[PDB]
Amino acid sequence: SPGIWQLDCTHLEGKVILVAVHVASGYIEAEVIPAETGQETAYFLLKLAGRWPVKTVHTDNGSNFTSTTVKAACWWAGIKQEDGIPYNPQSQGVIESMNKELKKIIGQVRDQAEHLKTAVQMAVFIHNHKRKGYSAGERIVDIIATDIQ
Amino acid sequence: SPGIWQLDCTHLEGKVILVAVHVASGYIEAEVIPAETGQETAYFLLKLAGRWPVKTVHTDNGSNFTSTTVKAACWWAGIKQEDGIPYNPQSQGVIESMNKELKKIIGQVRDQAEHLKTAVQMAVFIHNHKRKGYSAGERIVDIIATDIQ
């Protein structure tokens, strides 16, 4: 569980926001791309795995599970690529409520940013710093440091 | 200590690689941009501070120190924007040797990537996972978790 991440793809302003959620903490990283492709998802996972110790990624749909480019990046970065089937039903709900919350925050900051990608990084920042009591940024550091020791 | 980062800008292939180094651990994050501007540097800092608890950034030159857009992003994200004058002379040398090592790694992987930005993320991954005995990725999590407790 310190190493398990889930991918999530949501839409806004005609663009795609791709999110990686560290399952145990709720910490997220996200980017804006014009559309979800295997190549974009692969590059995003390579960025993620250089920054956090990514053991397993539950992919967000069967196209990214099947993509040879995603499987290449997961091979390169030492990630086990898995499906993202909600075996625990409560998963669909937690991801959905997260997307709704992120879009809410995006709308609250959107006029402070020229580009959507700036508003999405402001939402990532607010999500990861929010306490409710430790924040997700605290929880993920505590979980990994405990693993290391 | 835990919250101090230094910016660093190096060139390859006619493009610019902008790097943030967490000074206490040597952990890095990087991106490729066509040229260093205040707008790009500001967006990069907003990404970094949503991901790690950035208290202080030593900027890499006087243009990004002066830039109103960089000061706006540091205000938004709660960062103290500082100069990057090497009061400790050993600093120039540490940065320069890091740039040289990153370029060496980029050249070692460059034929595995279509785009430079992929090669730079592979170099980030190799730099942060290298042990010499803890890696920089381990050290930054240890340092931050110790600070939280």
């Binding site: 295997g38 190549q39 590059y43 480019t69 290449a72 | 595995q112 990537a113 279509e114 785009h115 992929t118």
Partner: peptide, 8 residues
């Protein structure tokens, strides 16, 4: 193109 970021 047999690259990690573009396997075509």
């Amino acid at each position: 193109s047999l690259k990690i970021d573009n396997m075509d």
